[PDB]
Design a protein around this motif. Structure first.
Motif, PDB file in Angstrom:
ATOM      1  N   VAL A 257      39.990  60.945  93.426  1.00 45.46           N
ATOM      2  CA  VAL A 257      40.249  62.234  92.783  1.00 45.46           C
ATOM      3  C   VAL A 257      41.739  62.494  92.878  1.00 45.46           C
ATOM      4  N   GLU A 258      42.384  62.715  91.747  1.00 46.13           N
ATOM      5  CA  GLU A 258      43.821  63.028  91.726  1.00 46.13           C
ATOM      6  C   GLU A 258      44.004  64.447  91.199  1.00 46.13           C
ATOM      7  N   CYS A 259      45.132  65.054  91.615  1.00 50.80           N
ATOM      8  CA  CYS A 259      45.405  66.456  91.337  1.00 50.80           C
ATOM      9  C   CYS A 259      46.812  66.511  90.756  1.00 50.80           C
ATOM     10  N   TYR A 260      46.956  67.135  89.590  1.00 52.37           N
ATOM     11  CA  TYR A 260      48.258  67.245  88.927  1.00 52.37           C
ATOM     12  C   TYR A 260      48.832  68.623  89.135  1.00 52.37           C
ATOM     13  N   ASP A 261      50.133  68.646  89.559  1.00 50.26           N
ATOM     14  CA  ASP A 261      50.901  69.875  89.717  1.00 50.26           C
ATOM     15  C   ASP A 261      51.886  69.957  88.562  1.00 50.26           C
ATOM     16  N   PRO A 262      51.747  70.899  87.636  1.00 47.75           N
ATOM     17  CA  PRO A 262      52.672  70.923  86.502  1.00 47.75           C
ATOM     18  C   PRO A 262      54.089  71.303  86.896  1.00 47.75           C
ATOM     19  N   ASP A 263      54.287  72.023  87.997  1.00 50.40           N
ATOM     20  CA  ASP A 263      55.640  72.470  88.312  1.00 50.40           C
ATOM     21  C   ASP A 263      56.497  71.320  88.807  1.00 50.40           C
ATOM     22  N   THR A 264      55.904  70.416  89.561  1.00 53.70           N
ATOM     23  CA  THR A 264      56.633  69.251  90.040  1.00 53.70           C
ATOM     24  C   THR A 264      56.392  68.023  89.181  1.00 53.70           C
ATOM     25  N   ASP A 265      55.469  68.099  88.211  1.00 50.34           N
ATOM     26  CA  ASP A 265      55.085  66.973  87.358  1.00 50.34           C
ATOM     27  C   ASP A 265      54.727  65.764  88.219  1.00 50.34           C
ATOM     28  N   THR A 266      53.834  65.994  89.171  1.00 48.56           N
ATOM     29  CA  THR A 266      53.361  64.937  90.053  1.00 48.56           C
ATOM     30  C   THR A 266      51.851  64.984  90.219  1.00 48.56           C
ATOM     31  N   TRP A 267      51.255  63.784  90.326  1.00 51.71           N
ATOM     32  CA  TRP A 267      49.864  63.616  90.688  1.00 51.71           C
ATOM     33  C   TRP A 267      49.803  63.220  92.157  1.00 51.71           C
ATOM     34  N   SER A 268      48.795  63.717  92.854  1.00 48.85           N
ATOM     35  CA  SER A 268      48.567  63.236  94.206  1.00 48.85           C
ATOM     36  C   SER A 268      47.073  63.014  94.413  1.00 48.85           C
ATOM     37  N   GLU A 269      46.747  62.107  95.325  1.00 48.37           N
ATOM     38  CA  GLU A 269      45.344  61.829  95.553  1.00 48.37           C
ATOM     39  C   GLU A 269      44.868  62.800  96.618  1.00 48.37           C
ATOM     40  N   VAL A 270      43.817  63.548  96.329  1.00 51.86           N
ATOM     41  CA  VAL A 270      43.460  64.660  97.191  1.00 51.86           C
ATOM     42  C   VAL A 270      42.195  64.419  97.968  1.00 51.86           C
ATOM     43  N   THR A 271      41.301  63.593  97.478  1.00 58.60           N
ATOM     44  CA  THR A 271      40.038  63.395  98.165  1.00 58.60           C
ATOM     45  C   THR A 271      39.404  62.216  97.457  1.00 58.60           C
ATOM     46  N   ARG A 272      38.328  61.709  98.029  1.00 59.72           N
ATOM     47  CA  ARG A 272      37.516  60.721  97.321  1.00 59.72           C
ATOM     48  C   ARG A 272      36.117  61.292  97.165  1.00 59.72           C
ATOM     49  N   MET A 273      35.473  61.016  96.025  1.00 58.59           N
ATOM     50  CA  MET A 273      34.062  61.305  95.913  1.00 58.59           C
ATOM     51  C   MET A 273      33.267  60.459  96.902  1.00 58.59           C
ATOM     52  N   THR A 274      32.007  60.871  97.156  1.00 56.77           N
ATOM     53  CA  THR A 274      31.201  60.184  98.164  1.00 56.77           C
ATOM     54  C   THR A 274      30.770  58.826  97.668  1.00 56.77           C
ATOM     55  N   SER A 275      30.812  58.566  96.352  1.00 57.53           N
ATOM     56  CA  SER A 275      30.654  57.219  95.830  1.00 57.53           C
ATOM     57  C   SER A 275      31.312  57.166  94.471  1.00 57.53           C
ATOM     58  N   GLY A 276      31.698  55.962  94.055  1.00 56.75           N
ATOM     59  CA  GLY A 276      32.356  55.786  92.767  1.00 56.75           C
ATOM     60  C   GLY A 276      31.373  55.973  91.627  1.00 56.75           C
ATOM     61  N   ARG A 277      31.871  56.479  90.511  1.00 60.64           N
ATOM     62  CA  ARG A 277      31.025  56.764  89.366  1.00 60.64           C
ATOM     63  C   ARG A 277      31.901  57.093  88.175  1.00 60.64           C
ATOM     64  N   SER A 278      31.348  56.888  86.959  1.00 63.28           N
ATOM     65  CA  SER A 278      31.989  57.312  85.729  1.00 63.28           C
ATOM     66  C   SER A 278      31.009  58.201  84.961  1.00 63.28           C
ATOM     67  N   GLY A 279      31.475  58.821  83.859  1.00 63.38           N
ATOM     68  CA  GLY A 279      30.519  59.466  82.950  1.00 63.38           C
ATOM     69  C   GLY A 279      29.865  60.706  83.483  1.00 63.38           C
ATOM     70  N   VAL A 280      30.541  61.416  84.347  1.00 55.28           N
ATOM     71  CA  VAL A 280      30.064  62.658  84.982  1.00 55.28           C
ATOM     72  C   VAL A 280      30.333  63.863  84.112  1.00 55.28           C
ATOM     73  N   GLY A 281      29.603  64.947  84.398  1.00 50.37           N
ATOM     74  CA  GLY A 281      29.965  66.280  83.878  1.00 50.37           C
ATOM     75  C   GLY A 281      30.585  67.058  85.031  1.00 50.37           C
ATOM     76  N   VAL A 282      31.665  67.768  84.773  1.00 52.14           N
ATOM     77  CA  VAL A 282      32.383  68.514  85.798  1.00 52.14           C
ATOM     78  C   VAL A 282      32.622  69.918  85.302  1.00 52.14           C
ATOM     79  N   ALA A 283      32.531  70.892  86.218  1.00 53.37           N
ATOM     80  CA  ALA A 283      32.928  72.261  85.901  1.00 53.37           C
ATOM     81  C   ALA A 283      33.261  72.989  87.184  1.00 53.37           C
ATOM     82  N   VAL A 284      33.901  74.141  87.063  1.00 53.72           N
ATOM     83  CA  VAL A 284      34.261  74.933  88.228  1.00 53.72           C
ATOM     84  C   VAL A 284      33.633  76.308  88.117  1.00 53.72           C
ATOM     85  N   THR A 285      33.134  76.815  89.244  1.00 53.53           N
ATOM     86  CA  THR A 285      32.657  78.213  89.370  1.00 53.53           C
ATOM     87  C   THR A 285      32.462  78.537  90.834  1.00 53.53           C
TER      88      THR A 285
END
Ligand SMILES: CCn1nnc2c(C)c([C@@H](CC(=O)O)c3cc(C)c4c(c3)CN(C(=O)c3ccccc3)CC4)ccc21
Ligand SMILES: CCn1nnc2c(C)c([C@@H](CC(=O)O)c3cc(C)c4c(c3)CN(C(=O)c3ccccc3)CC4)ccc21
Length: 285
Positions: A257-285
């Motif tokens: 999982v990478e996280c982009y900061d627009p102010d510094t224009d940098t990506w950083s790796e913030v965490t890993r999912m509990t297993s690798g996967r593609s084709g997910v649905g994601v949302a926040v609430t």
């Protein structure tokens, strides 16, 4: 605190996982399984409830594209079925405007849809709206200023750099400026008046590049690339940063999982999912 939810996905088969990541402390929670494992679905939130839309299921009896809509309530940790869409939509994009869910494109077998349909939760009803100008599967969708954008994807023959916008008040689609890069299965999201398109697949390789469409200038410009190339990734925005989750890099199913900061224009790796996967649905609430 708001949580980042990941539902379903693909790792050797369609997956039923529902998990939530808390940015405040970096931890992951495992939640009620999807009733039907699905890859190639999309997630969104309305009214504090998470919806899982479309996708594809693997079973011993065969693989099936899905018309399903299911709703998850974080307070009860329960899934409930909703009315299905008019057609199966695997490799779907979704966006929300005014509390309505728009289901965009995707495929049903060999059929690559240009159709689009809209769901009203209070009535549990779907109805078709005007179709896109282009058939798009693996399309990325986001909403900005109450307009719905459909970005990239695959039309049955070509992967696409085109993009188009739907105007709900006119019930019409119009093309917008094309991206610099052909992308199917990109992560598409909205942050600070720009639409971002991260990663994807161009028919030859999975990409690490990221570009953004400024709604004032109508121009696509590259920003910093992600550390890892990835297609079929999950994406969302939380507190001013973009998070990309998992995907495929041609060699493995990613847990990064990478996280982009627009102010510094940098990506950083913030965490890993509990297993690798593609084709997910994601949302926040
Ligand atoms: C066209 C409709 N559609 N939509 N989604 C589709 C998906 C998910 C597939 C599957 C197969 C299927 O479910 O039938 C699929 C697709 C790909 C591209 C790969 C694998 C499986 C399994 N891979 C591996 O484990 C792997 C990968 C890297 C290293 C080692 C092993 C290989 C890559 C097919 C068709 C689908
Ligand atoms: C194999 C070369 N490749 N790499 N990346 C590829 C991608 C994004 C695609 C597109 C379709 C296309 O351009 O036609 C695509 C787009 C999406 C959103 C999804 C899948 C496939 C299939 N889903 C997977 O979880 C998946 C993706 C890749 C591998 C295994 C499973 C579900 C979601 C095809 C082909 C690609």
């Amino acid at each position: 605190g708001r949580l980042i939810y990941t539902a379903g996905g693909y790792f050797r088969q369609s997956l039923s996982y529902l998990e939530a990541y808390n940015p405040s402390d970096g931890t992951w929670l495992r939640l009620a399984d999807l009733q039907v494992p699905r890859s190639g679905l999309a997630g969104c939130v309305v009214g504090g409830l998470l919806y899982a839309v479309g996708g594809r299921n693997n079973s011993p009896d065969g693989n099936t594209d899905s018309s399903a809509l299911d709703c998850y309530n974080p307070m009860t940790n329960q899934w409930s079925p909703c009315a299905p869409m008019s057609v199966p939509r695997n490799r779907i994009g979704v966006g929300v405007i005014d509390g309505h869910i728009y289901a965009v494109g995707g495929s049903h077998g060999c059929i690559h849809h240009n159709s689009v349909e809209r769901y009203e939760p209070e009535r549990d009803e779907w109805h078709l709206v005007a179709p896109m100008l282009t058939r798009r599967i693996g399309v990325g969708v986001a909403v900005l200023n109450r307009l719905l954008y459909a970005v990239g994807g695959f039309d049955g023959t070509n992967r696409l750099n085109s993009a188009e916008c739907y105007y709900p008040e006119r019930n019409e689609w119009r093309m917008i400026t094309a991206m610099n890069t052909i992308r199917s299965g990109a992560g598409v999201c909205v942050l600070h008046n720009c639409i971002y398109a991260a990663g994807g697949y161009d028919g030859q390789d999975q990409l690490n590049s990221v570009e953004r469409y400024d709604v004032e200038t109508e121009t696509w410009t590259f920003v910093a690339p992600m550390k890892h190339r990835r297609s079929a990734l999950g994406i969302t925005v939380h507190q001013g940063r973009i998070y990309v989750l998992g995907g495929y890099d041609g060699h493995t199913f990613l847990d990064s999982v990478e996280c982009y900061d627009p102010d510094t224009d940098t990506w950083s790796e913030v965490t890993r999912m509990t297993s690798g996967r593609s084709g997910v649905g994601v949302a926040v609430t």
